[PDB]
Structures are given as structure tokens and as C-alpha cells.
């Protein structure tokens with residue numbers, strides 16, 4: 001339903017795709033393009049307008065029926081073919097196509113990896129992408145920093161101490177364990193930013209994602225309390241475009257429907273300028289429900305004792 | 315997860331329940347209370363504090379495990395018993411309880427009836443409520459009026475005419491068929507209000523809800539275009555409380571998590587003062603997906619020809 005309105009109205013995201021595709025007619029002319037999760041078909045339309053010989057869109061949604069009408073209303077029924085189905089249940093691609101030159105996908109989830117189609121795209125890549133072929137986009141980088149969020153933490157967390165006079169503190173750890181998807185103001189940031197993960201769709205393998213372990217390090221700029229870490233991702237169309245096309249979901253630039261991801265700390269960190277926060281973040285699917293994402297943090301401040309907190313995005 | 319944060323933070327709703335319960339200790343003292351869909355247990359806690367002998371909460375959610383801890387942390391483990399389960403799959407109530415004096419429930423959905431627990435409450439009533447017993451709340455009234463919403467209609471509807479130069483108009487009827495749950499400003503209202511439905515939980519029967527047919531009539535106050543109808547409901551704890559307790563989800567009062575429900579019109583209505591809009595609204599569950607709600611409108615303006623529009627809440 002309205003899920004497609006949201007992405008189309010996400011101007012930062014859609015223009016990034018539009019520019020990467022339409023500015024590179026030379027790369028798209030007469031090629032075979034596969035759009036994974038085509039939805040309403042806007043990306044397919046871009047690729048057709050850019051000169052592709054064939055655009056094959058896959059989507060498991062019933063949106064497909066109306067996407068075909070949109071393709072026809074814009075004159076592309078001979079170029080764009082849409083398939084209702086999960087990518088995993090496609091025997092052959094139509095028209096006897098066996099390899100494709102370009103895969104377009106919008107796979108990125110919240111916190112990049114939450115309920116993402118990454119695995120589906122990697123399988124499509126392994127089954128169909130010709131050697132040397134291109135993934136639009138193909139590189140995503142995650143960043144993390146520390147913020148001051150005293151107001152929002154007292155409202156979302158310490159609310160549970162006294163609810164109409166009752167003690168609801170038994171719920172507090174469950175409130176803390178859920179990362180919040182929300183916009184953060186950049187003036188709340190009180191540390192440098194740390195690139196802590198890069199995902200390269202040209203090289204990554206499916207088993208690399210079973211469990212992600214990574215490191216992060218950032219530096220306090222203020223005498224201040226830190227109540228949360230905030231994380232976002234930048235996405236780059238790097239291989240293929242004549243010039244690289246980029247967009248960010250971070251707080252320093254116009255918002256996107258992914259917002260940012262806020263990880264509330266159990267205990268506020270009192271930070272002095274030049275204090276160093278460094279640790280590891282481990283990301284993996286939840287054992288009891290595979291749609292859920294387990295995120296585990298272990299870090300220190302100036303070598304202090306290890307602080308550890310576990311989150312579940314569900 | 316955070317669904318319970320939302321209702322607790324809904325002050326209009328929670329205070330209405332708190333006042334109806336805690337202001338009527340005389341009615342609750344030494345009685346047996348059933349809370350349908352108890353969640354975190356706040357309503358159970360109110361009923362216990364009001365003097366109930368026994369409070370039985372039912373919830374099909376795993377929230378129950380933490381709700382039991384909250385009950386214990388507030389000293390009520392001997393009064394409040396919680397059952398994980400659907401009401402439809404409960405053999406006997408515990409402690410050999412066979413009848414109950416009061417049913418509390420928060421059954422109201424969006425547009426009152428969308429994904430509501432009404433049917434579950436009526437079954438609990440028929441199985442367990444003693445003759446003459448009370449339902450908290452027991453009366454809900456729906457209201458509807460016409461609004462000016464030219465800005466939001468051009469953004470949510472005529473957006474589809476031209477999307478990055480492409481014609482997406484094939485989607486426009488699907489955008490119009492989805493009612494929007496959103497807040498409306500009262501100064502957008504340009505008609506009188508029409509009570510079009512009342513639900514009396516003391517008397518209503520399950521088969522009465524298979525298909526609801528009702529009438530509405532309201533009157534234009536301005537020379538203006540009408541782009542949508544807006545609907546909300548008021549809820550009343552009428553039988554039981556010493557004085558009636560009420561709350562509204564309408565635009566003239568503080569917002570609630572139910573917001574209001576906006577029905578965009580296919581064709582704007584040009585209204586003159588004292589123009590009369592009258593018709594029928596038919597509400598029933600969708601044949602192909604029973605979670606969905608079909609809403610059909612047929613109306614006239616000053617006896618003009620019949621205008622009809624169909625909506626699906628899904």
C-alpha cells in the first residue's frame with residue numbers, strides 16, 4: 001500500500017537513483033537490466049528511459065499488476081517485463097535471458113541491515129550478473145557517533161519508573177534494548193564520527209553476513225554526558241557511473257525515510273574532551289525469530305573497564 | 315513492543331480509564347473484573363487499586379510475562395491473575411470463576427472498527443458477564459463532517475499524475491481508496507457534524523456487525539470546496555460509573571493515538587452555505603482479506619444525483 005508512496009516521496013533516495021541511471025545513458029544503452037524489488041516500477045522506468053534493451057523487474061508484491069499498467073501508460077511495455085514472484089522461486093528469466101549486465105536494487109533497511117533484501121540481491125548477483133557487471137548501488141558505509149539526548153531519554157526510558165503511580169521499571173530494560181528509528185539533530189552530536197562497516201556488493205559473500213563483527217572508535221569533543229549512540233549509512237553507486245553518485249541518511253543532510261538509528265545507553269557516559277570511545281559491534285540474526293536483528297556492543301572509554309550492552313531490532 | 319508505550323502515553327485515553335475506574339471504588343470493591351487485552355496491565359492495576367477482589371487479565375501477547383512482574387512489583391500478585399491466550403481458547407477462568415461483574419476493554423480501532431477487538435469483547439460478554447454486569451467502556455459514537463484539505467489532497471493524490479515526468483495516474487484510484495489516519499485541524503471543518511453510528515456494548519449482537527448500514531446528514535457552513543470527509547468517535551463509560559466518563563478522538567480536543575480518519579473525495583464538492591449532504595455509509599469486512607474493512611459511501615447534495623465512492627482500510 002502506502003509503502004511505495006514513502007520511497008517515491010523520499011527525494012534524496014530517488015534522485016540519487018535517477019542521477020546514477022539517467023546520467024549514464026552510455027552505460028545503459030542496449031543492455032539487459034534486472035530490477036530487484038521493482039515496486040511501482042520507477043527504477044525500471046529510469047533504466048528504460050536511459051536506453052536499456054530489456055528491463056526485468058521482480059517483485060513478490062501484488063503491486064506488480066498496477067506497475068504493469070504504469071509501464072504501459074508510459075510506452076515501455078516492449079522493454080520492461082515484470083515478474084510477480086520471489087527471486088528465489090524464478091526458474092528462468094524471460095526471453096531466454098541467462099545473464100544480465102546491471103542489477104538495480106533498493107535493498108537497504110533500517111540500520112542498513114534490518115529487514116534488508118541484501119541476501120536476495122547477492123543471490124540474484126550470483127545467478128545472473130555477468131562477470132564484470134554492475135550493481136546499482138554497490139557500496140554502503142555505516143557511521144556511528146555519540147549524542148546528547150537527555151530530554152528524549154527521560155521521556156522514552158525513565159518514564160517507566162512511575163506510571164500513574166505504579167512501578168513499571170520491570171519494562172525499562174526492554175525499552176533500552178530496542179533501538180529507535182528517528183531523526184537526530186546534528187547539534188546533539190558530541191563526538192567525531194566513526195566509519196564502522198563497509199558493505200561492497202561486488203565482493204561480499206552470503207556467509208560473510210551470518211555474523212558481522214566490526215570495530216568503532218570515536219572521540220569526545222565536549223565536557224558533556226552521552227546518552228546514546230546514533231548510526232546511519234551512506235550509499236554509493238561506485239562501479240559503473242561515469243562519476244560516482246552518493247547519498248547519505250545521516251543527520252547533517254536532508255532526511256530520508258530511513259532516518260537514523262538511536263542506541264540508548266543503559267548508563268550515561270560522562271565525557272571529557274579528547275576522551276576516546278572504542279569497541280566492537282556484533283550484528284547477527286536473532287535465533288528465535290530470524291526477522292529480528294541482534295546488535296551487541298562492547299566498548300571502553302580511555303581504556304576503562306568494558307561496558308557491554310545488547311540490543312534487538314524487532 | 316512499543317505498541318504499549320503508545321497507549322500509556324495516550325493521556326486522553328488512559329486518564330479516561332483511570333477516572334472511570336478509580337473514581338468508582340464503590341462499584342469495584344470486592345468484585346470480579348475481567349480485563350480483555352490487558353497488555354502491560356495498567357487497567358488491571360487500576361481495578362485492583364479500586365478494590366476488586368479478583369482481576370483476570372487476558373492477552374495473547376508475550377507481554378504477559380513482563381506484565382506479571384509489574385503486577386508483583388506493585389504488590390497485587392494475589393489479586394491480579396494474567397492469562398496468556400486468545401479469549402476464544404480459554405476453557406475456564408481461574409479460581410473456579412464462572413461469572414464476572416465487570417469487563418474492561420480497550421477494543422476501539424482506527425475508525426472505531428478497523429482491526430478492533432469488538433467481537434472478542436462481545437464473546438467474553440456472552441460467556442462470562444453476569445446479568446446486569448458492566449462493560450468499561452460501553453458506548454461509542456461516530457461522527458463525520460466535511461473539510462477543506464486542498465493542500466494535502468494535491469500532495470497525496472494528484473502527486474501521481476506526474477512522477478519524475480512519468481504518468482503514474484494508474485495508481486490514483488488506489489491512493490483515493492485508502493482512508494488516511496491523520497490529525498485534521500478543526501479550522502478545516504466546513505460542515506456541521508453528523509452522528510452516524512452508535513455502538514452499545516450492553517445490547518449489540520455479533521451478527522449485527524456482519525454488515526453495518528447507517529445514514530449521515532450534515533450541512534455546509536461556507537462557500538468553499540470540500541475535498542474530504544473526516545470521521546472520529548467518542549467513547550463513554552455510561553452504565554456503572556456514578557457520573558459518566560467520556561473522551562473524544564475528534565479534532566476539537568486534544569489528540570489521541572487514534573487521530574482522525576480522512577476519506578478523500580474523488581471529485582471535490584463545491585458547497586454553498588446551507589447545502590445539505592446526506593447519504594449512507596456501509597461498513598463490512600473485506601471478502602478476500604478479513605483483516606480489511608470495506609467502507610462504501612453514497613450521498614447527494616441538495617438532492618442532486620447520487621455520488622458513490624468505495625474505500626478499503628487495509
Ligand SMILES: Nc1ncnc2c1ncn2[C@@H]1O[C@H](CSCC[C@H](N)C(=O)O)[C@@H](O)[C@H]1O
Nearest residue numbers: 007037038039040059060061085086087120
Ligand atoms: N525476496 C523478494 N523477492 C522479490 N521481491 C521482494 C523480495 N523481498 C522484498 N521484495 C519487494 O521489494 C520491494 C522493495 S520497495 C522498492 C520499491 C521501488 N524501488 C520504488 O521506488 O517504488 C517491495 O515492494 C517488496 O515487495
Ligand SMILES: Nc1ncnc2c1ncn2[C@@H]1O[C@H](CSCC[C@H](N)C(=O)O)[C@@H](O)[C@H]1O
Nearest residue numbers: 321351352353354373374375399400401434
Ligand atoms: N483475541 C484476543 N485475545 C486476547 N488478547 C488479544 C486479542 N486480540 C488482541 N489482544 C491483545 O489486546 C491488547 C490490546 S492493547 C491494550 C493494552 C493495555 N490496555 C495498555 O494500556 O497497555 C494487545 O496487547 C493484544 O495482544
